[PDB]
Amino acid sequence: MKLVMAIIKPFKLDEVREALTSLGIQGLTVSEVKGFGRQKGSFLPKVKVEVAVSDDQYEQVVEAIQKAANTGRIGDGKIFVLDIAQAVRIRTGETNTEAL
Amino acid sequence: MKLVMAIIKPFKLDEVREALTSLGIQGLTVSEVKGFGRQKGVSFLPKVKVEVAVSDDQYEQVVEAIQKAANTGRIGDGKIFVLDIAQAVRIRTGETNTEAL
Amino acid sequence: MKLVMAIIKPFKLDEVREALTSLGIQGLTVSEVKGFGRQKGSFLPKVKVEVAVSDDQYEQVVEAIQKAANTGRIGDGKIFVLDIAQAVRIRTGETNTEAL
Ligand SMILES: Nc1ncnc2c1ncn2[C@@H]1O[C@H](COP(=O)(O)OP(=O)(O)O)[C@@H](O)[C@H]1O
Ligand SMILES: Nc1ncnc2c1ncn2[C@@H]1O[C@H](COP(=O)(O)OP(=O)(O)O)[C@@H](O)[C@H]1O
Ligand SMILES: Nc1ncnc2c1ncn2[C@@H]1O[C@H](COP(=O)(O)OP(=O)(O)O)[C@@H](O)[C@H]1O
């Protein structure tokens, strides 16, 4: 299981969500953050997208976020992939990919 | 060492904290986030993100405590994810590994 | 690759940034968070710094954040190091350390 963490330009959230929804992703968690980088504004507002995804889906998810969030201009952001050891759905107690 | 990350309904935070304190967990970090899921709002709902680093010998009990504390049985209760922490340091003391917690 | 996640006192952000800049660390992602701990006010505002860094630099980064963020008073916070499986720069498709 993977935690896909994307830092993107805020106006790209909707496009990112449509791309994810089309892939059948059932949900995601979004934070407002401050991004320091080479893009000239010493920071710009960014949006952090965190979505837990199965091993069989994570590569397509990364690709879809990348395509949807890309403008070709400096500041577009990063996608980091971290591994998730265990996952639980709080409501049902389902685990692993059933928790997603 | 584990980073236990829980996305919960905001009104469950106090119970979650009390459950963690009851297990001797000395602290935790909390963020306000927007949760997109099946629960209806209007696309997202406010959620709380709880991040707590815990030792290997405590993490299972922590995950259970959070699950029980944050459960309502209604849609939108959220998720708990367990990530592995390679190293940890307490800034004030330089303590590392479980001593950092 | 490592994700270095530091939870620090808000007034230490500038010191932490400048220390990282000295290491040629380009960017970083900053979040406003609430910290529950032994420090007495409930919670206190903290700053979460997330910086992805190469294996050959992460220890120096951890040291630099620790030295910069330390006051010796309760509430200074924590640094956690998590391993990053993959990383992509959205703008270019660059991966691994080139993504940083
Ligand atoms: N080493 C890093 N670790 C974590 N986040 C980073 C790092 N470098 C950049 N970022 C995030 O990526 C955003 C964009 O970086 P920037 O250099 O401006 O554009 P690009 O990603 O196109 O190079 C930053 O605002 C910051 O939030
Ligand atoms: N794949 C995912 N990755 C990360 N967070 C998610 C994911 N799916 C859902 N969430 C988070 O969990 C919350 C609850 O989702 P929801 O489908 O409404 O209810 P339930 O958790 O009961 O299935 C969402 O608002 C969102 O914050
Ligand atoms: N187990 C934990 N997991 C995640 N964050 C923690 C944990 N314990 C403490 N923190 C964070 O560290 C901050 C400082 O903790 P505190 O006990 O007040 O001081 P010190 O870090 O100097 O021991 C807290 O406000 C909280 O953000």
Provide the residue ranges of all domains of chain C, joining segments of one domain with +: 1-100
Distance from the A81 Cα atom to the nearest Cα atom in chain B, whole angstroms: 12
Helix (H, G, I), strand (E, B) or coil at B23: coil
Question: How many Cβ contacts (< 8 angstroms) between chains A and C?
Answer: 73
CATH code for B1-101? 3.30.70.120
Q: How far apart are CA C37 and CA C44, in angstroms?
A: 9
Helix (H, G, I), strand (E, B) or coil at A7: strand
CA angle C74, C19, C65 (to 5 degrees): 35
Does any CB of chain B come closer than 8 Å to the CB of residue C7?
yes
CA angle A38, A39, A44 (to 5 degrees): 115
Chain C residues close to B17, C-beta within 8 Å: 36
C29 CA closest ligand 1 atom index: 27
Question: Are the CB atoms for B98 and B1 separated by under 8 Å?
Answer: yes
Would you state the structure tokens that stand for residue C25, as one six-digit string?
Answer: 């660390």
Q: How far apart are CA C32 and CA B38, in angstroms?
A: 27
- Alpha carbon B62 to chain centroid, angstroms: 8
Question: Are the CB atoms for B54 and B7 separated by under 8 Å?
Answer: no
CATH topology of domain C1-100: Alpha-Beta Plaits (3.30.70)
Residue whose Cα lies nearest atom 8 of ligand 3: it is B27
Cβ–Cβ gap B81/A28 under 8 Å:
no
Q: How far apart are CA A40 and CA A90, in angstroms?
A: 42
In angstroms, what CA-CA distances link B49 with A2, A63, A78, B16, B52?
A: 18, 26, 21, 11, 10
In angstroms, what CA-CA distances link B35 with B6, B10, B24?
A: 12, 11, 29
Q: Which of B81, B44, B19 is nearest to A90 (CA)?
A: B81
Q: Give me ligand 1 centre to Cα C90, in Å.
A: 10
CA angle A23, A25, A30 (to 5 degrees): 125
Cβ–Cβ gap A78/C99 under 8 Å:
yes
Would you state the structure tokens that stand for residue B25, as one six-digit string?
Answer: 């967990």
- Alpha carbon C98 to chain centroid, angstroms: 19
Is the CB of C38 inside a 6 Å radius of any atom of ligand 3?
Answer: yes
Chain A residues close to B67, C-beta within 8 Å: 88, 90, 93
Q: Which of B11, B54, B6 is nearest to B30 (CA)?
A: B6
Which of A89, A90, A94, A100 has the highest number of chain B CBs within 10 A, making it the mutation to test binding with B? A90
DSSP structure class, residue C11: G
- Output the CA torsion C90→C91→C96→C100 (10° steps): -100
Q: Which of C5, C6, C4 is nearest to C69 (CA)?
A: C6
Would you state the structure tokens that stand for residue B26, as one six-digit string?
Answer: 């000395």
Chain C residues close to A8, C-beta within 8 Å: 90
- Output the CA torsion C78→C11→C83→A100 (10° steps): 90
DSSP structure class, residue A65: H
Experimental technique, in short, is: X-ray
CB within 8 A of C34, min separation 6: which ones? B29, B30, B31, C43, C44, C45, C46
Would you state the structure tokens that stand for residue A33, as one six-digit string?
Answer: 């953050």
Question: Are the CB atoms for A49 and A68 separated by under 8 Å?
Answer: no
Helix (H, G, I), strand (E, B) or coil at C74: coil
Question: Are the CB atoms for A96 and B79 separated by under 8 Å?
Answer: no
Torsion sign (Cα): B3, B6, B12, B15: negative
HSE at residue A21, side-chain half, CA atoms within 13 A, is 10
Can you list the pairs that A12-18 forms with residues at least 24 positions away whose Cβ atoms lie under 8 Å? A12/A47, A12/A68, A12/A69, A12/A71, A13/A47, A13/A49, A15/A68, A15/A69, A16/A49, A16/A64, A16/A65, A16/A68, A16/A69, A17/B36, A17/B43, A18/A68
* Documented resolution in Å: 1.7
Q: Give me ligand 2 centre to Cα B78, in Å.
A: 5
Distance from the B45 Cα atom to the nearest Cα atom in chain A, whole angstroms: 10
Q: Give me ligand 3 centre to Cα B4, in Å.
A: 14
| Nearest CB to A76 within list C30, C31, C91 | C91
**Which residue has tokens 């970090």?**
B29
